[PDB]
Amino acid sequence: MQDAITSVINSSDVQGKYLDASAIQKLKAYFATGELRVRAATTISANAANIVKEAVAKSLLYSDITRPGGNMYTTRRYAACIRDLDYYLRYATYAMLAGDPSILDERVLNGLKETYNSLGVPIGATVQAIQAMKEVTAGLVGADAGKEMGIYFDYICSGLS
Amino acid sequence: MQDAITSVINSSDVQGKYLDASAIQKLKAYFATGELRVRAATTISANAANIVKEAVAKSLLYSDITRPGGNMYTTRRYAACIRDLDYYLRYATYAMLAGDPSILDERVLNGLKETYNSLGVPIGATVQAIQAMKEVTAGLVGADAGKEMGIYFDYICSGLS
Amino acid sequence: MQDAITSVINSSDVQGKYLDASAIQKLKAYFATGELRVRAATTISANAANIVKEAVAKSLLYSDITRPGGNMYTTRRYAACIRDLDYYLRYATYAMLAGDPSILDERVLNGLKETYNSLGVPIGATVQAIQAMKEVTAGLVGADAGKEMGIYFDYICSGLS
Amino acid sequence: MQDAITSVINSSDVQGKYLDASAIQKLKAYFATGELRVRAATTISANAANIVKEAVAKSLLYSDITRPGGNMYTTRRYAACIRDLDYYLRYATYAMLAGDPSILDERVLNGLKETYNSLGVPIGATVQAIQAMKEVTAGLVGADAGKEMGIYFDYICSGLS
Amino acid sequence: TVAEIKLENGDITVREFIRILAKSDVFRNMYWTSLYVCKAIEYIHRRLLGRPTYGRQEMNSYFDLCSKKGFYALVDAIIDSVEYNEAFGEDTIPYE
Amino acid sequence: SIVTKSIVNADAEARYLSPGELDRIKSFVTSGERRVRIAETMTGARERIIKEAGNQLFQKRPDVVSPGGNAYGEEMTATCLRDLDYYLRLITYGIVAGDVTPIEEIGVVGVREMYKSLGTPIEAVAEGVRAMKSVATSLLSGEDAAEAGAYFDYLIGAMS
Amino acid sequence: SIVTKSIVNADAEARYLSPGELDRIKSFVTSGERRVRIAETMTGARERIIKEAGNQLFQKRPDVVSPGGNAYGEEMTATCLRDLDYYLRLITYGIVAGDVTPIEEIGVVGVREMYKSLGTPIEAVAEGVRAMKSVATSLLSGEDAAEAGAYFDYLIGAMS
Amino acid sequence: SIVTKSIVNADAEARYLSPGELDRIKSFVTSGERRVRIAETMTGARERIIKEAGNQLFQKRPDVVSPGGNAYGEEMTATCLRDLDYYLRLITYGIVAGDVTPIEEIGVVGVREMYKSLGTPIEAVAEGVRAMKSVATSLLSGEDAAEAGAYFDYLIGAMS
Amino acid sequence: SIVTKSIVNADAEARYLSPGELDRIKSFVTSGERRVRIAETMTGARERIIKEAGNQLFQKRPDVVSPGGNAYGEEMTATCLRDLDYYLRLITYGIVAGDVTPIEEIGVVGVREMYKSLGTPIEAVAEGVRAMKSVATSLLSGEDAAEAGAYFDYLIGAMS
Amino acid sequence: SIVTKSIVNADAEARYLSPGELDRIKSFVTSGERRVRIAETMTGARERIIKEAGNQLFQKRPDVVSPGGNAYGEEMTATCLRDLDYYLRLITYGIVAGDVTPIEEIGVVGVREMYKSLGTPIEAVAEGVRAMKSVATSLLSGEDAAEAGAYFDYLIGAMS
Amino acid sequence: RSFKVTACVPSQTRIRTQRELQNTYFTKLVPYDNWFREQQRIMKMGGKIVKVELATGKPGTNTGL
Ligand SMILES: *[C@H](C)[C@H]1/C(=C/c2[nH]c(/C=C3N=C(/C=C4\NC(=O)C(CC)=C4C)C(C)=C\3CCC(=O)O)c(CCC(=O)O)c2C)NC(=O)[C@@H]1C
Ligand SMILES: *[C@H](C)[C@H]1/C(=C/c2[nH]c(/C=C3N=C(/C=C4\NC(=O)C(CC)=C4C)C(C)=C\3CCC(=O)O)c(CCC(=O)O)c2C)NC(=O)[C@@H]1C
Ligand SMILES: CCC1=C(C)/C(=C/C2=NC(=C\c3[nH]c(/C=C4\NC(=O)[C@H](C)[C@H]4CC)c(C)c3CCC(=O)O)/C(CCC(=O)O)=C2C)NC1=O
Ligand SMILES: CCC1=C(C)/C(=C/C2=NC(=C\c3[nH]c(/C=C4\NC(=O)[C@H](C)[C@H]4CC)c(C)c3CCC(=O)O)/C(CCC(=O)O)=C2C)NC1=O
Ligand SMILES: CCC1=C(C)/C(=C/C2=NC(=C\c3[nH]c(/C=C4\NC(=O)[C@H](C)[C@H]4CC)c(C)c3CCC(=O)O)/C(CCC(=O)O)=C2C)NC1=O
Ligand SMILES: CCC1=C(C)/C(=C/C2=NC(=C\c3[nH]c(/C=C4\NC(=O)[C@H](C)[C@H]4CC)c(C)c3CCC(=O)O)/C(CCC(=O)O)=C2C)NC1=O
Numbered sequence A, B, C, D: 001m002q003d004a005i006t007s008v009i010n011s012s013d014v015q016g017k018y019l020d021a022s023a024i025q026k027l028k029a030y031f032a033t034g035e036l037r038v039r040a041a042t043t044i045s046a047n048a049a050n051i052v053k054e055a056v057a058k059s060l061l062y063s064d065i066t067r068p069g070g071n072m073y074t075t076r077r078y079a080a081c082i083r084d085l086d087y088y089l090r091y092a093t094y095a096m097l098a099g100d101p102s103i104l105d106e107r108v109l110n111g112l113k114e115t116y117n118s119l120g121v122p123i124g125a126t127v128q129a130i131q132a133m134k135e136v137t138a139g140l141v142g143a144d145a146g147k148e149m150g151i152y153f154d155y156i157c158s159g160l161s
Numbered sequence E: 001t002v003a004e005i006k007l008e009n010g011d012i013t014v015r016e017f018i019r020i021l022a023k024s025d026v027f028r029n030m031y032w033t034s035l036y037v038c039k040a041i042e043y044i045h046r047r048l049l050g051r052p053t054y055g056r057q058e059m060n061s062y063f064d065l066c067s068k069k070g071f072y073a074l075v076d077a078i079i080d081s082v083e084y085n086e087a088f089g090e091d092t093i094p095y096e
Numbered sequence F, G, H, I, J: 001s002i003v004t005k006s007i008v009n010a011d012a013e014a015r016y017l018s019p020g021e022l023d024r025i026k027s028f029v030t031s032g033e034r035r036v037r038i039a040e041t042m043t044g045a046r047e048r049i050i051k052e053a054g055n056q057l058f059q060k061r062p063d064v065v066s067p068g069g070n071a072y073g074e075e076m077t078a079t080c081l082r083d084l085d086y087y088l089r090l091i092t093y094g095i096v097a098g099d100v101t102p103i104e105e106i107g108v109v110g111v112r113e114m115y116k117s118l119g120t121p122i123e124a125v126a127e128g129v130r131a132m133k134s135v136a137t138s139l140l141s142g143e144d145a146a147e148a149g150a151y152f153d154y155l156i157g158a159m160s
Numbered sequence K: 001r002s003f004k005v006t007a008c009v010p011s012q013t014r015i016r017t018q019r020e021l022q023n024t025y026f027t028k029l030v031p032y033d034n035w036f037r038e039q040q041r042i043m044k045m046g047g048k049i050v051k052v053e054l055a056t057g058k059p060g061t062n063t064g065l
């Protein structure tokens, strides 16, 4: 739940002392990179229905999985697969705006073995969808913002496998 | 739940027999000290918010759990600990009139171990608190019922351990 | 739902007077005839499924009202009006112990007028049934308490017609 | 549920036209006075319990309804009343930022008029209390914002009376 | 049945009928008295709202409410929430 | 028992026990000697109760002995007198426990569906308890018949 | 009252009131000529109970009499005897009622609100009430204060 | 921080962060050096604040120190200064975070259940914060007293 | 009617009626005259189908005629014919509608709470109406006793 | 609006406004003179925006202006623009409020039932309101084309 | 202690294809201790409270509820 601000003032609360100059320097390291994230979080929010559109066509479409016998065959399953991908963009922008992958341990990595195993979701196609989604996102957002966003995409698929 | 009569009754019901004289002896001992417990239950419910204040200042306050780092440092988490001790004073006084620790078993101590271990709540401070609380109620009710009230407090500290 | 004990409590606090001398003989009138009521209310529960044996069998059983065309001819309208007579007995016995008809106009007489004019229930059949069940209780509790039960039975028939 | 920006929108929509010059003269008038409305929102919500503990002190604390015979001796009835007068402070400060009396209509005024007649409580003592609430709140926030909060207090006052 | 014939009369709605159902002693014996407390918070939340509990702060708001007010306001506070009233309505039987 | 109604009806409001309900606890442990003498005498003549109240029940309702009924033959009437001995035992639990609840749980809450699945009439056993209370209140004292006869009266009044 | 609490409990089970509880109303009515001596003794000492228990409270908590607490001054110590007299004007409403149903609805249900809303800490209010119900137990008999003192000491745990 | 409550208010609506709230985040990060200058002047005079506001609390309420109430000697008065040291520490945490959520999760949830168990008055803590408000706003600048004092009133809304 | 069951089957999902469902109505119209020929065979042969099949019930269950049971020879066995005559009247109401609900709303919905209060075995009614419709299927044909056979068996499974 | 959303979210938790949220309203009110001149940028040039998107819609889809289509003839074409005249009025309400809340309650919650009933294709409207978007942002400035265009792009995806 | 409301509430966001006549005219009985958590539910929905009636006993009676 916490961010780079509320990890510093949580860890400096619990020692009992006030905010000191070793911890304010950690806040200024977040405040120097804060302007980079708000430009990064704006452009993904205007293209959330289009990053998902290209990345499904990057790795998922015209496969076994799109075809019958695969998993995303029925229209009912298909939309869901966009929707079960669209949380992975919205929660990754929240952790990019936070500067901490503490949202991602908390909202979007709880059942993520056990929901997907108890629904017939293949894990190995979701990890292949996400670095197909990371490549089009870092192309859309830039080289500098792409590696900060690239931590929180690779935080998800490492916890998902 | 279960009561000391309804445990003596249910012992002679699953055997199917009638009331044995040993069971009749086991009911006269409940009725001989039943007049003591009915005066003991009022004197704790009079001071039920008072005892917890006299318990938490005996062994928890000015110590290292209500200081930065401990589980009672956050002062709106220490408010959980007061009503956590309101339960163990209430349900022990239920079990004093019941003549039976079966109030505490399937209502309090069934999932109490799994709640505390899933939060990092110190077990060893809770037994440090409840065994400190047992001295306070025995001071207020007298040494007659303090043996009776000391049993069901010790049932709480045994199953939590 | 309040009895005659709470009613003289209700009429004593509100004017600024204490528990005066004139309230005591209202309570002593309750405490004199209250021993009669516990002898009364047990024996109604002995015949609570037997007054309704006599309720149909005196004024309703072999009549033209039960003959196809009347109001009490359906099995969904038969069994709905034994429970509607059984509730009128049970709430009378609450008032038999209350010394007060102030359980009747909260739970019985709240919507009972308009639900009989709308559902096609004849009012005259009920007061020929309820007042018929006054005197069978006069043979079960003795002479005096049936005249006490006849107050709340007439309070039903004053509040139904 | 609306506010003063969308009420200008709604008064222009149901009339039909676009944002005409009379509405922009009304809407720019809201944005000038909207700066003082925030600085008087915080100093009410600071002293929200301190206002209502003094507004009862001007009118209600030594009167007909403290000597026995009125609304508040019964501890639930006084504690509802402090809680009712608390919610007048919340909704008027919700009415102060929103810039309209219509938020008070769909949240306070429609239901409350017929309950207070039916529950037998005086409206004349309530409108004496809110007028006593008006003369303390203007002393706290200053007089110039007191003319703002004097509007929505009177809309409760004229609405209830 | 005295909870039931108010619904058949139309004097109460179904949402008031569910509250007057699950305040009875037969529901209180079956799922409150004979269970652990945070089990019994979760099971009445399972039946009436038709979903499990959402997390921790959604359950800590219920555990203090039955610590102070009792079981009768636990079964109240499930029913007059926004997620009961706007996802089921005031005339539907709840479903999982 | 007396606590089992009071420890549940005050737990559900999550309060401590009100001293009106502590009268109910006090109210009996002074009666626990008087409640124990009566169930010792009820068990002590439990053979004479079933052989007498079972006897003139069939002079009142002779249908269940008759063929076409359930208890045709001695192999079923002795099975029928098990439920008389069970309900006599469930009376003696309820007098000692003090109130309505142990006879309610063990022998009441399924008897409209137990006896319907057995095909037996649910009303005829309700006639027998009124004769079981007739022979019992005929043999005990007068002051306890207002106590011990009323625990009979519950398992009548929720049977039929 | 104890009549009122039994009949609302029997409505919840949708049956008649049990013979376990019918002992208690029968025990209440034979003690209805026992409860009335407690009620008349508090008439004769209501100017004696309150005027001693104030100074018993003010020697226990003299923060009240200091300038700054919620009862400082002669006009302000009027209510700190009057609210104590109001609680002595609550027990005699429920001695003869037997239990706490006039104690709640006049005294308890919002008492965490209004003493916070008047600024008085209830821990001082419950202390003088505890100081009151030591003197009233000494004034009454040993059998009277055995049950009424249990009924006295409900309010201290109910307030704080 | 201001990042957290721009997320949990945007997760309940289940959509992205609109640019109506992203500009306030974008104005927050460029104004980072202003808040550290508020915080360092706040914590740099932590002995000037509590030794002045401890006196101004005791002139507003002299009953905590007078014999009978809560805080005595140089031990129990000193832990009253410890809690004011906590709330001075807890209010500079929300100034740097730019939001009232770090003072929320530590100290704006549940003390009305807590302080009544401790026996301290809740409202007398709130008069200590208003003396702490007037000391720090007199020390801080003319513009930031409307910003640092915009957290000081939030503690008054917690207790009172 | 089968028209009436079809609308509420469509009104629950707020739908116009399916053309496959109107095929069931159009088949019901062209077979509407056949069911009237089924119903007159019951009403014409009523005096041979009631006194015989009731006597089959009394031969299967001779518990009924014997005293101590529900019936007795002078009119109680005669009024158990008219309480059996009502159901044959309800079958003829049901077969001309092509629906179950004329059997339901007149003679199913409260029969258990009725006959417990009346003191008859409800299962003996179910064995009696089983004896009623065993001879009713052999009355008319072998073809028409199958789709009128589907309304015979429902009342057997409604009593128990 | 942001004023409406911040009250209703704070009313449901029974709380006053947070100081993080009060500075949201404070910046929203003071920037209200910025947003009203974006609204008068469109209403000052509304009769050109309708006419250019009038020519731009019927170019990309000519079946609606064709005979047989739902806007055929000089009065039946007049209406489709007047329907587009409503959506200039709606989006001008949305820029002023700073939210799509007047887009909701006035304009978009029933369009999937209305034009299906009215026979006009929703996707024919969805390009005409998209050709409105291309002619609007060419007339606006650089930064507010993201601000006003979010209310445009909300009306595309909620239409189609 | 039951009230007798009558409440007119509209459908805010959805267009319900089932009838739901009863979902616009709750004229139910609500008890006193839970009316006020229930009254705010109609009030936040945008409904109109038409009348409230004391179907139970007398106001001003401070005992016996
Ligand atoms: C206090 C002296 C000790 C202590 C308490 C503490 N408890 C919690 C959290 C919980 N306590 C419970 C308690 C119970 N659940 C039950 O079912 C029963 C039987 C009736 C009891 C007694 C529960 C459910 C919780 C957690 C749910 C929640 O989110 O609140 C906390 C909070 C821990 C936290 O970090 O949030 C604390 C501090 N801990 C101590 O240190 C004392 C020994
Ligand atoms: C002082 C101005 C007021 C006051 C203070 C007082 N407090 C205590 C005891 C405690 N206070 C706390 C409060 C907190 N601890 C925290 O960690 C935080 C947030 C960071 C808060 C708000 C706690 C937990 C205790 C108990 C143990 C402890 O001291 O930590 C006392 C002592 C009371 C006693 O009986 O020992 C005092 C005097 N009380 C007043 O009267 C002033 C109004
Ligand atoms: C963030 C919290 C959260 C989690 C974890 C979540 C998981 C999630 N994924 C699901 C479904 C699904 N998900 C997929 C998955 C995919 N499509 C593909 O082709 C890929 C292989 C894969 C993902 C890229 C399928 C194929 C179904 C099942 C839908 C169904 O059968 O109902 C479902 C069931 C749909 C439903 O709710 O009924 C859930 C709950 N939803 C959430 O809100
Ligand atoms: C606890 C207080 C209380 C009472 C007394 C009460 C009565 C009551 N009687 C009702 C119906 C009924 N009441 C009767 C009454 C009778 N039939 C007759 O033959 C006689 C005229 C009368 C004998 C008692 C009938 C026939 C119906 C059902 C109407 C129908 O058949 O559709 C209904 C409508 C719901 C239903 O039962 O279907 C109520 C609410 N309700 C209460 O809550
Ligand atoms: C019978 C039911 C009943 C209750 C529960 C009740 C509470 C009550 N106490 C009050 C005042 C008060 N009560 C007190 C009593 C106390 N404060 C102290 O500091 C003392 C230590 C303490 C007594 C233990 C005082 C001093 C006031 C007036 C407060 C003020 O004027 O600021 C008031 C406002 C004045 C009035 O109209 O009486 C109410 C309503 N009144 C009632 O009629
Ligand atoms: C937010 C919109 C809103 C309003 C305004 C509101 C009022 C309201 N006032 C009530 C009670 C009450 N209110 C008072 C009020 C007073 N006593 C006095 O002497 C004064 C004249 C006055 C206040 C100082 C009294 C005596 C009662 C109890 C009367 C009863 O029991 O019905 C009740 C019943 C229970 C409850 O408190 O929740 C409601 C619902 N409810 C609402 O939803």
Ligand SMILES: CCC1=C(C)/C(=C/C2=NC(=C\c3[nH]c(/C=C4\NC(=O)[C@H](C)[C@H]4CC)c(C)c3CCC(=O)O)/C(CCC(=O)O)=C2C)NC1=O
Pocket (backbone or CB within 6 Å): F064, F070, F071, F076, F079, F080, F081, F082, F083, F084, F086, F087, F106, F107, F108, F118, F119, F120, F121, F124, F125, F126, F128
């Ligand atoms: C603890 C609660 C409880 C009771 C009391 C009880 C009785 C009981 N009655 C039984 C049978 C039976 N019980 C009866 C008894 C009667 N039918 C009548 O007509 C009379 C009304 C009545 C006796 C006078 C009959 C006839 C059977 C045999 C049913 C059959 O053969 O179909 C059986 C199965 C036979 C056996 O195990 O020996 C049990 C267990 N069971 C229980 O679980």
Ligand SMILES: CCC1=C(C)/C(=C/C2=NC(=C\c3[nH]c(/C=C4\NC(=O)[C@H](C)[C@H]4CC)c(C)c3CCC(=O)O)/C(CCC(=O)O)=C2C)NC1=O
Pocket (backbone or CB within 6 Å): C061, C062, C066, C067, C073, C074, C075, I064, I069, I070, I071, I076, I077, I079, I080, I081, I082, I083, I084, I086, I087, I090, I106, I107, I118, I120, I121, I124, I125, I128
């Ligand atoms: C169509 C819906 C409907 C039904 C079913 C109905 C039944 C019904 N059956 C009745 C009686 C009766 N029914 C029986 C029946 C039996 N006793 C036995 O031994 C046999 C096992 C059994 C049937 C085969 C007896 C003996 C009575 C008279 C009971 C008495 O007078 O005490 C009575 C009371 C007297 C009468 O008016 O006829 C009704 C109203 N009324 C209706 O409106």
Ligand SMILES: CCC1=C(C)/C(=C/C2=NC(=C\c3[nH]c(/C=C4\NC(=O)[C@H](C)[C@H]4CC)c(C)c3CCC(=O)O)/C(CCC(=O)O)=C2C)NC1=O
Pocket (backbone or CB within 6 Å): J064, J070, J071, J076, J077, J079, J080, J081, J083, J084, J086, J087, J106, J107, J118, J120, J124, J125, J128
């Ligand atoms: C502000 C919210 C609002 C909307 C959305 C609205 C729609 C609306 N469009 C209408 C008709 C119409 N609307 C159109 C518009 C169109 N058809 C086309 O072919 C074009 C492609 C398209 C425009 C993009 C036309 C041609 C008619 C008349 C159709 C007829 O009369 O059959 C009508 C019926 C007559 C009337 O205008 O009063 C309504 C109510 N009215 C409103 O108040």
Ligand SMILES: CCC1=C(C)/C(=C/C2=NC(=C\c3[nH]c(/C=C4\NC(=O)[C@H](C)[C@H]4CC)c(C)c3CCC(=O)O)/C(CCC(=O)O)=C2C)NC1=O
Pocket (backbone or CB within 6 Å): K010, K011, K012, K016, K019, K020, K021, K022, K024
């Ligand atoms: C099954 C019997 C039944 C019907 C028909 C029924 C109708 C009904 N029409 C309603 C609204 C409405 N009804 C109309 C009606 C019209 N518009 C016009 O201009 C014409 C005059 C008229 C139709 C030709 C309008 C404009 C509304 C929305 C206003 C409102 O919220 O009441 C609502 C309010 C809820 C909603 O739809 O948002 C209901 C419940 N309820 C029922 O129980």
